Amino acid sequence: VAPTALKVLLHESKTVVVDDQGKPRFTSASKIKFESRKIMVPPHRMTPLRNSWTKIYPPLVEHLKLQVRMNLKTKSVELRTNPKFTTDPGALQKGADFIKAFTLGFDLDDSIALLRLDDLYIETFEVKDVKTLTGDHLSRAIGRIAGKDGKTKFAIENATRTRIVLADSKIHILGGFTHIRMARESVVSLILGSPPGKVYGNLRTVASRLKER
């Protein structure tokens, strides 16, 4: 004793039984398919794949619950639906699209948007489809789309609310169907020969409309 002291609550039977109405009465009975996707990765994108895949398998294997692997021998990324774990039927296709976006040249975080949402698409077209440009004319068109320091491309990305990968004369646009469409006309207008400054003005107009709605 201290010296400062005082002083939890609450086999099917092989037969039938006939009831008063003559009806038979029986006992109760005893109480996502495996799929694969192949996407090949081109040579120029695999080094980005190597240093980035530490951030690519987690969302696929965890959120989409897909069975991920790639073939070094064929240089292709592989995804499979695991029947005992996978639950979303569309996950496997969704994973394939996300891998494809990285393959086309989009940033990884940009590609994750495909996994996060269900309404993102990639629009793809080529410069000659708009107008047959060759030699220096083709090169100047590509520069016009990109702009000095890539400013023109970023202007379209922010205004139309999409992304654009300008792989030589090959153009890919990622976003919502209407959004990716809006980008195309601005890109095409540049191809046809509209000066970047005049194009930039139209971007500001549509961007305000986007914020209003």
């Binding site: 708009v130 107008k131 047959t132 006309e185 207008s189 046809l192």
Partner: peptide, 11 residues
């Protein structure tokens, strides 16, 4: 040849 013509198409 394509439908656009020399000056291009898909304005």
């Amino acid at each position: 040849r394509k439908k656009g013509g020399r000056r291009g198409r898909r304005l």
